[PDB]
Amino acid sequence: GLFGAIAGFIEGGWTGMVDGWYGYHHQNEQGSGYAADLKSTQNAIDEITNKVNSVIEKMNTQFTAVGKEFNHLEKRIENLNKKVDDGFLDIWTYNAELLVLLENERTLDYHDSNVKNLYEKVRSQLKNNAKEIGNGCFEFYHKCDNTCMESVKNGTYDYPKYSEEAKLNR
Amino acid sequence: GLFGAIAGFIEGGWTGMVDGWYGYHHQNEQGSGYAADLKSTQNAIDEITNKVNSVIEKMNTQFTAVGKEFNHLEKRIENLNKKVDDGFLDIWTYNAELLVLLENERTLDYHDSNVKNLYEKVRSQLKNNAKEIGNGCFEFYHKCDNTCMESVKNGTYDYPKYSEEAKLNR
Amino acid sequence: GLFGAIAGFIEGGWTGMVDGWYGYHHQNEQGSGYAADLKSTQNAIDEITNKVNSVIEKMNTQFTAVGKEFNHLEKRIENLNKKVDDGFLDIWTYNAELLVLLENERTLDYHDSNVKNLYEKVRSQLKNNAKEIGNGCFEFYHKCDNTCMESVKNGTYDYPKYSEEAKLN
Amino acid sequence: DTLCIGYHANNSTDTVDTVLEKNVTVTHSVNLLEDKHNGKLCKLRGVAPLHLGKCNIAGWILGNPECESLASSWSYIVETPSSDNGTCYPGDFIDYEELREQLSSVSSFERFEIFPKTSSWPNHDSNKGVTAACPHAGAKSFYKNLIWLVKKGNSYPKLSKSYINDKGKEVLVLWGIHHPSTSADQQSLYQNADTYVFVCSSRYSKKFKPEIAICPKVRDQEGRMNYYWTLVEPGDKITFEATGNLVVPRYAFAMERNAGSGIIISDTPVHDCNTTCQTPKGAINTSLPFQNIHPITIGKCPKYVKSTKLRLATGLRNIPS
Amino acid sequence: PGDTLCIGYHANNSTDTVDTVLEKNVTVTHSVNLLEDKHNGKLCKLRGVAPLHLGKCNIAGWILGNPECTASSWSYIVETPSSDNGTCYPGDFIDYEELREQLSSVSSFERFEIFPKTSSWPNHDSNKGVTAACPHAGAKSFYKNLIWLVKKGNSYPKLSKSYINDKGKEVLVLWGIHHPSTSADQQSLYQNADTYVFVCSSRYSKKFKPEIAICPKVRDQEGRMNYYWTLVEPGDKITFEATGNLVVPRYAFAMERNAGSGIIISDTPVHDCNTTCQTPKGAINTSLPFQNIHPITIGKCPKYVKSTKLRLATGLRNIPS
Amino acid sequence: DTLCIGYHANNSTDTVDTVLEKNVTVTHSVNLLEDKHNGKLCKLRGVAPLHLGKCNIAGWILGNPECESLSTASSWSYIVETPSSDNGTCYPGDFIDYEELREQLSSVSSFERFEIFPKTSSWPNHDSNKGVTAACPHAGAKSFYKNLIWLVKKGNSYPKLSKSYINDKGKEVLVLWGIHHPSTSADQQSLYQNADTYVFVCSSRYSKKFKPEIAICPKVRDQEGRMNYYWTLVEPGDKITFEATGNLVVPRYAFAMERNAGSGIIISDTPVHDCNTTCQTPKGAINTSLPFQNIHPITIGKCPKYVKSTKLRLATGLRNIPS
Ligand SMILES: CC(=O)N[C@@H]1[C@@H](O)[C@H](O[C@@H]2O[C@H](CO)[C@H](O)[C@H](O[C@]3(C(=O)O)C[C@H](O)[C@@H](NC(C)=O)[C@H]([C@H](O)[C@H](O)CO)O3)[C@H]2O)[C@@H](CO)O[C@H]1O
Ligand SMILES: *[C@@H]1O[C@H](CO)[C@@H](O[C@@H]2O[C@H](CO)[C@@H](O)[C@H](O)[C@H]2NC(C)=O)[C@H](O)[C@H]1NC(C)=O
Ligand SMILES: *[C@@H]1O[C@H](CO)[C@@H](O[C@@H]2O[C@H](CO)[C@@H](O)[C@H](O)[C@H]2NC(C)=O)[C@H](O)[C@H]1NC(C)=O
Ligand SMILES: *[C@@H]1O[C@H](CO)[C@@H](O)[C@H](O)[C@H]1NC(C)=O
Ligand SMILES: *[C@@H]1O[C@H](CO)[C@@H](O)[C@H](O)[C@H]1NC(C)=O
Ligand SMILES: *[C@@H]1O[C@H](CO)[C@@H](O)[C@H](O)[C@H]1NC(C)=O
């Protein structure tokens, strides 16, 4: 929601793209299909993996035998001990619950950002050589075969090359 | 703010818009006025309510007495008990204070994000047929009656319909 | 980054702009050089230091003497005391570590945001009288001198005053 | 023709702090800090507390004549800060804090006469055991729950009394050991001079010898009386054996102790109200996670913090302009 | 007519949901659980060292060598919830919980005969000290680690006996003090009537006198026996002196105590497995920060929480539509 | 004619971690972790600690001949013993509720030593001038605790002793005494004449009867006998009474005091200085606004919270991309 792409102007996900988190669907004279963008996907995988390992590995735990034994004339200290365990119980329960709720919202936003950036990176390349037809799609004003497509995917797109043909179909 | 809109390129707020959090101000023949986007507003209301409810409801505390009584030869344990009480106090105080500081920034970002999103939703629709005159406003290059406006807000603006007229006033 | 500017469409930073966090580089017929945006740099400084001060001043602790002495027949309470110190140690070590990881992310994102909002601020001024040539740069569809160049840096740029010259280019 | 995107602003003055900026006026907000209380001591879990008025736990459990208060159950105990009325005869009350704690909440409580006065002590005097240290309406008296036994007709036979707990729950038994200031008083009260007291159940076992010396007057007494207690488990038996100096039980208490509660010491009045969180200053009725009323609370309570203001933004920055 | 390139995101058949601060039950493509909720239902080695399991006995029964009850080191101790009485002859085990705590984890532990039965007591009878309270195979018996010395041929001379600790580590020494029910029993066992016991090291020192009394019968004993212990530092000396009523050490224990762990009381079975976190219900393989198995744990454990689910989103919102 | 929007970069190699990425170079950063101390023991809240030199709390309070008896400031914010402090209870025995006393003396706003029972006038019927021992040597000679007197029989009798002190000091008085347990009956008689003795001490709140326990115990500092030490606090207006027919090591000096709350005892060779601090560590004082510290878990004052972190680098500037 935060960046408007996921479940926003791009209304739904693709079960057909099964090799990445973010990618493209193309349709040209030669054919069509799905292709995950490997750069952005691996970067996300690396970073989300770093996130999980951080939430996990930062928990340095001391060696502790929690349990204690008190006799019938030691109820005050038995109750102090209970207060200690119950105090840590509430502290860890509340913080873990909120950590999860808060990091989850951040994780989704992160993905939404990644998609938004990917879309606007393509849009910046194509400029006026294609039209933004919505739902995360561009419709080219020129013919864009496989090599043309693949060059848009991996940043090496040649705008001036198709400039001429583009201006025509407008 | 993080998303640039509120107290950004949209410098001020509308007291006039009493029906919601975010909305539109339309002007044309037939009239003008403020109108909140009830969809994004209600969505935001639901989501923020859930936020507030999460911070409250995730606090489920144990039954505890806290108070302890120690005699004049139990000073050490009396001070142990004091350290427990004081440790819990410092932890919950720091945590409650920061939670509010942190989450208040997040909530403000959230509202900013919602506005920015509204603004860009209109931008991607109008394109040429209107002038982005800054300060959150768009000036149409064509006549835009009530149902034209409503259409922009409803996300079903028919660009081709006004394409012709639009170009001409340019 | 979250806002796709820093290490995004603006690939790198400027060692040459030493008087601020965000800024400009101009290059007209007259000359060139670097110039920080003072209002956006100062606000970020105002807000970041406030972020540092907040994390610091919200920690207001009790007068405590942590240590306890227990004899050879008070092992249980000694271990109880040990469980208390260790429990606070684990709570604070965890919270401190995650506080830092999380706020560092937010801070880097914050800068990312500021740069983007500055860029979209000038793009909002130069409207039709310039072309976004990439990598955070604008190429004026007209001729801009030192006086004009400062109009864009202050939010006082005049569009209709160049509209006619640019329409032909 | 224009279409503008914008945001709400109102007449709100509410302020919140954010991590990046202090005192931001916003359109809507909520408080996360409970700072109100009702200035009443109320029921917990629907169960009223035990208010001891001017008496303390010691004076009440022993039967201090001044402590004719009023229940069979309580959620916690309340003493007033000005509650002196307890051990009227000076001495040491052994494991008193432990007892207070263990009596802090009971689900069932019953005073019964474990050693009936009229029939338990035929060879000893059970009527002269009174003192000006424990007055009742100005007159010499004693704890109602114990009997100060003295020699009868120049003789203190060896007494031996056992009690078997057929109550089906824990029985609290309290007794005293008297230490005269002089060998003269020892002989006058108990005849024998070199005496002993023995108390033992299946769990408990302790021998007592009188400790005779002139100690500093307290409530005008140079002598001392130490108080002892134990809980006799169901089916268990407790045995008393003495040749002097024993302040025998008269009343004991059958009870079922309840988890673990607390003792509030406050002048705050009790009322017919209900709460889930009790403070010495009054009850807290909140759904909020934090509280700055009092750190010493009983029940299911919000966490105590030293915050004055914990205000969550819900709306956005208020900029009416 | 145009060719098209669309930008989009992954979806799948995943049914995993997560909660966020803003919305509940959000289906996501990938997630991980932060909460450990599974255990192996076994008691395992901690730090690669097995716990000491006491079978049907408790620590008292084991350490005293109760007749009814080879590990030179252990990481914690296990007792079953229905373990038999350790002390057969009734009495108080002084500082019992402390001893248990101090024995919870040791390295190096060696039972040795501190006072050899054959040569230590030429003037006392070290055979007749058996009792109906500590039966074994239809015969009156007694603890294996102690000797109940009684008079030989109508005399009980003063005994004086010392041990110097040359084990190079702490030596645990246990002894007993017998308090007969009657004078007759006193004389029948020890001859002397008025007796004392003294035990002192460089650090420990206590004098005991029998407290003759008839207490409620427990395992047929109206008398009582109290158990004492001390840890003698390396190179230090411990001395025993008595004119009666002393249940003497026979076996003592050289041990090196670890910082310590705890005692798990549970019927969960011990197995030859390895763990870093032990629970009374079973072991948990600590990877995750949190755990809802059991609040009482031993080792390097995840923190206990009352949570049912702590699901962390890794992937994005799942929208297959 | 171009105008570019850009951001700062510099020569810095400062690095930070984020939940998403490790070792991210940044333009500016600050540490949230206090890892410096000053290596001194300082005055806490403006008040110097009490440093016990070569003595422990027991030796000091009993007046072991090696300790410096007031002297001793009339106030201190905490107590410092060294790890090598050897001089305590030179005559072997048990110090009852020792840890409790140590805690209770840890911080005092007023402290005055005074002669509760003058040596010369208090004990006409007993010998108050022979109670010395090789266990408590001084300048190469038998000696004893300065604050106690080992009373012994006069001539060949030890009359029943009875002596009280009424507290006119206006605040709590700490009174200490000992009970001597000879190794043998011979010694019991040699010292106290009476073979079967008792000691009794009581005030309005305290009461205890003591009975000598004669036995030959392991030799410590040449002593097979033992001496146990006891203490109590006598509130203003109250009296403490001593009764004995032998074996009582009587008070000579006592202490008028006003105790503060908490504080503790630091055991360290770290040098004491004329510096002021709000947070004290056994290895040095902390002077910092930072909320976290990794110096030491055992601190006294208003201190940062202890963590096991080694660094806590907080980013203040942006990702540093000099390229
Ligand atoms: C000037 C003069 O000689 N006055 C005495 C006056 O002191 C004395 O009063 C008695 O003083 C003794 C102390 O020696 C006790 O304090 C007596 O108090 C009582 C008490 O109330 O506690 C009287 C009470 O009846 C006694 N109760 C029993 C069961 O015996 C107790 C009890 O003996 C002690 O508490 C045990 O230590 O003491 C107090 O009356 C009067 C009375 O003879 O005579 C004057 O001459
Ligand atoms: C010896 O063990 C038995 C159990 O085998 C003990 O019986 C328990 O007694 C305790 C109170 O002391 C109760 O809490 C339990 O409910 C009893 N168990 C049952 C159901 O019988 C007995 O107390 C022990 N005996 C001795 C001498 O200590
Ligand atoms: C104080 O401690 C010192 C040691 O630090 C003791 O000095 C020793 O005393 C013994 C017994 O007289 C002598 O044999 C040694 O030669 C001394 N050693 C040193 C280092 O001088 C001293 O006994 C202690 N004094 C008191 C009263 O406790
Ligand atoms: C709003 O959009 C929906 C489709 O999502 C359409 O059916 C409806 O007619 C639209 N309303 C207006 C006023 O255009
Ligand atoms: C048990 O695990 C520990 C490490 O966790 C190891 O030291 C030891 O060798 C292991 N024992 C076995 C039998 O694997
Ligand atoms: C604390 O540090 C400041 C400088 O930051 C210094 O001036 C001051 O003397 C220090 N205070 C103490 C008492 O150490």
Side-chain angles (χ1 to χ4, degrees), chain C residues 52-140:
Chain C
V52 171
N53 292 346
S54 289
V55 167
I56 286 168
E57 61 202 354
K58 291 301 178 177
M59 182 70 82
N60 204 331
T61 68
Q62 297 288 93
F63 172 98
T64 304
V66 172
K68 290 287 153 269
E69 308 174 312
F70 302 108
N71 60 52
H72 59 284
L73 283 173
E74 294 175 326
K75 221 59 185 47
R76 294 168 301 146
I77 56 180
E78 182 184 80
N79 282 332
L80 170 56
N81 180 68
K82 180 54 171 175
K83 176 169 69 179
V84 173
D85 293 353
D86 287 340
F88 291 158
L89 170 50
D90 292 337
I91 289 180
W92 285 116
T93 297
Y94 195 66
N95 157 267
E97 240 72 349
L98 288 203
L99 178 67
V100 173
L101 293 183
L102 300 176
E103 283 327 307
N104 282 349
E105 187 48 77
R106 290 233 82 206
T107 295
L108 300 188
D109 288 331
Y110 173 73
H111 289 303
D112 193 6
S113 169
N114 285 334
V115 172
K116 177 191 170 65
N117 291 347
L118 183 63
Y119 180 97
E120 288 191 352
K121 178 178 172 182
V122 42
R123 170 189 65 74
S124 179
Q125 286 185 101
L126 306 187
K127 339 207 177 186
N128 204 2
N129 306 352
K131 57 174 298 187
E132 306 184 38
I133 58 181
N135 204 338
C137 292
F138 294 91
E139 187 181 4
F140 289 90

Side-chain angles (χ1 to χ4, degrees), chain C residues 10 21 61 69 97 104 137-138, chain F residues 3-4 7-8 102 309 315:
Chain C
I10 313 195
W21 267 336
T61 68
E69 308 174 312
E97 240 72 349
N104 282 349
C137 292
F138 294 91
Chain F
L3 176 54
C4 302
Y7 47 83
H8 172 80
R102 295 170 56 94
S309 312

